[PDB]
């Protein structure tokens, strides 16, 4: 199937508490495989998935150097952002970056990403063309001008069409037992009387990977969008995810409700009832 590799940078300034912390986490799909934390006692790119551990020491040295250089770069970027927004050096600010690539089943680049936020707000994003930028504001427009001058989009594109997809392809192969295994949701409906008049039907999807799942309730075959409490898909901690969707149903009306589960691990969407 299709896959993604994403690196997520968080650079968090913390004036008075040392230099901005720089964290990178790398994911393939919903599998964290690498992390870097400048606050680690010995900051290094660290494997977080077994299949990345076979990458040689040159990989880890190069990736760690990337992250150390990035730590400095993103501290510089935080200073730059302070300037661009006329902000004091007293406040704590966050630069985030997500970049990486989606590949299709054939491993070819489906699309690239390189997007940045400042203080949780979109700042600048490489457009899907991997050639132009969307700057969120005039500060990001300064960045965009700099990056257009520096051909950053072209460099990104070369990475996204090359090393990004190539390394992701390798990771998918090395991690094929897990990265290329969808664990279907174990699904069930629980029944929780609220009162004499109402019961909660909670449709559970547990143990599924990847996280993407559609969990809906229908009443009489009609989607209960507004009447379904849908918890965020949440990590179980064993790589898998959980989600539930609950409906408050009148007592005795449980059979009017069907839970519908779409997940790539399910050959066909499941329909469950209490």
């Amino acid at each position: 199937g299709s896959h993604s590799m994403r690196y997520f940078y968080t650079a968090m300034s913390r004036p008075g508490r040392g230099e901005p912390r720089f964290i990178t986490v790398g994911y393939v799909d919903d599998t964290l495989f690498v992390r870097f934390d400048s606050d680690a006692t010995s900051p290094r790119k660290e494997p977080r998935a077994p299949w990345i551990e076979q990458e040689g020491p040159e990989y880890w040295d190069r990736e760690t150097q990337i992250s150390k250089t990035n730590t400095q770069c993103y501290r510089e970027n935080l200073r730059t952002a302070l300037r661009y927004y006329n902000q004091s050096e007293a406040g704590s600010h966050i630069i985030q970056r997500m970049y990486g690539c989606d590949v299709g089943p054939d491993g070819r680049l489906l699309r690239g990403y390189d997007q940045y936020a400042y203080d949780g707000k979109d700042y600048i994003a490489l457009n899907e063309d991997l050639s132009s930028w969307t700057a969120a504001d005039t500060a990001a427009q300064i960045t965009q001008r700099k990056w257009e001058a520096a051909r950053v989009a072209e460099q990104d594109r070369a990475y996204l069409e090359g090393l990004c997809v190539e390394s992701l392809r390798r990771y998918l192969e090395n991690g094929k037992e897990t990265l290329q295994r969808a664990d279907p949701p174990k699904t069930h409906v629980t029944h929780h009387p609220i009162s004499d008049h109402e019961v909660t039907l909670r449709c559970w999807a547990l143990g599924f990977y990847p996280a993407e799942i559609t969990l809906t309730w229908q009443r009489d075959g009609e989607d209960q969008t507004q009447d379904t409490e849908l918890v965020e898909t949440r990590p179980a901690g064993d790589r898998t995810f959980q989600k539930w969707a609950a409906v408050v149903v009148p007592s005795g009306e449980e059979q009017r409700y069907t839970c519908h589960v779409q997940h790539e691990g399910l050959p066909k969407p499941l329909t469950l009832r209490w």
Binding site: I66, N70, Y74, N77, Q155, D156, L163
Partner: peptide, 6 residues
């Protein structure tokens, strides 16, 4: 693998 450019 990362793209270190920054």
């Amino acid at each position: 693998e990362e793209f270190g450019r920054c």
